[PDB]
Amino acid sequence: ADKELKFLVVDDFSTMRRIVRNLLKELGFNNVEEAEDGVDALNKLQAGGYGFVISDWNMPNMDGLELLKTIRADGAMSALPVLMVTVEAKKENIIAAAQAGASGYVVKPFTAATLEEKLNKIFEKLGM
Numbered sequence: 001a002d003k004e005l006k007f008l009v010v011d012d013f014s015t016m017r018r019i020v021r022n023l024l025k026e027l028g029f030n031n032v033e034e035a036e037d038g039v040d041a042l043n044k045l046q047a048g049g050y051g052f053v054i055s056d057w058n059m060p061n062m063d064g065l066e067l068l069k070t071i072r073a074d075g076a077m078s079a080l081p082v083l084m085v086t087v088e089a090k091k092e093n094i095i096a097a098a099q100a101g102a103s104g105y106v107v108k109p110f111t112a113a114t115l116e117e118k119l120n121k122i123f124e125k126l127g128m
């Protein structure tokens, strides 16, 4: 995929945002911005130009599921890829996220190999 693709990494733990940013850097993606919850993410998305969102689930103010539903419902960004990356591992969470339009799902903790794979699967599926 295009190495200039612009990512938004959303997670309320700065520890986790840094981890994702660094793995993406390792894979060749340097165009990365950050948000600390769903409200903040929606503010940043309106700056335009974003091509991919990686989102946590548990966050204050607006959680990852609500963020996902908001993205899918808005004509400006309804086809934006959204990869969930979260501690929530239960079947019910995986099902709810998929039903709400998630592009993929990763359970923390995860390796760079898992991320590259999860990312690639989405790139192929969407023709990116």
Ligand code: BEF
Pocket (backbone or CB within 6 Å): 011, 012, 013, 014, 036
């Ligand atoms: F995660 Be933020 F920096 F509070």
Ligand code: BEF
Pocket (backbone or CB within 6 Å): 034, 035, 036, 040
């Ligand atoms: F990165 Be966030 F905006 F604190």
Ligand code: BEF
Pocket (backbone or CB within 6 Å): 056, 057, 058, 059, 085, 086, 087, 088, 108
């Ligand atoms: F807080 Be996240 F859902 F891992």
Ligand code: BEF
Pocket (backbone or CB within 6 Å): 099
């Ligand atoms: F459960 Be399906 F999406 F109607």
Ligand SMILES: [Mg+2]
Pocket (backbone or CB within 6 Å): 011, 012, 013, 056, 057, 058, 059
């Ligand atoms: Mg969290």
